[PDB]
Design a protein around this ligand. Structure first.
Ligand code: HEM
Length: 154
């Protein structure tokens, strides 16, 4: 897959709106993931005790981890597909330490798309949605290929 230049423009234009409140977006994405797919919370030893959404929102450490996640993701998107070097340390930890199947990346992709709609009702159009889905799909496919290069089945 390949994005057009105009699609990357839409992606980066939307990302500038994420960067204006990274913690608010990161916390919302994690909570959306955990409510929609509670099997994913069990991978997080530090947060697995959180049970209701109200608990999650008051957890300072969950919000900080949201920043960690979106910070890494934004660095990758900003490379517009030339991201082999940023992917490697990410692929290495999530395949071999955290043991995250690629299916869980699809789930966080859907959570990102939902939170962008919830947080930007008027800005996040169909074309922007399309471009973001493609950027995230590319991310998932290249990470699945790095899994295999490390000898893992994602
Ligand atoms: C956009 C997708 C994602 C990005 C950019 C991302 C990024 C990161 C980063 C930067 C870290 C900290 C350092 C590290 O261990 O690598 C981390 C930790 C972690 N990630 Fe992810 N991640 C993503 C998706 C996921 C998903 C979907 C899961 C599981 C459902 C997951 C599971 C974990 C776990 C379990 C840790 C360790 C948490 C801790 O500090 O105790 N990641 N991630």
């Amino acid at each position: 897959m390949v994005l057009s230049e105009g699609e990357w423009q839409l992606v980066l234009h939307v990302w500038a709106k994420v960067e204006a409140d990274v913690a608010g977006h990161g916390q919302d994405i994690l909570i959306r993931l955990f409510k929609s797919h509670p099997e994913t919370l069990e991978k997080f030893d530090r947060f697995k005790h959180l049970k209701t959404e109200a608990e999650m929102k008051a957890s300072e450490d969950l919000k900080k981890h949201g920043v960690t996640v979106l910070t890494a993701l934004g660095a990758i998107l900003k490379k517009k597909g030339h991201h082999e070097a940023e992917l490697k340390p990410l692929a290495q930890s999530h395949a071999t330490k955290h043991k995250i199947p690629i299916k869980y990346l699809e789930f966080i992709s859907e959570a990102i798309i939902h939170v962008l709609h919830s947080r930007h009702p008027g800005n996040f159009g169909a074309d922007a949605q399309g471009a973001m889905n493609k950027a995230l799909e590319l991310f998932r496919k290249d990470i699945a290929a790095k899994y295999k290069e490390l000898g893992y089945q994602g």
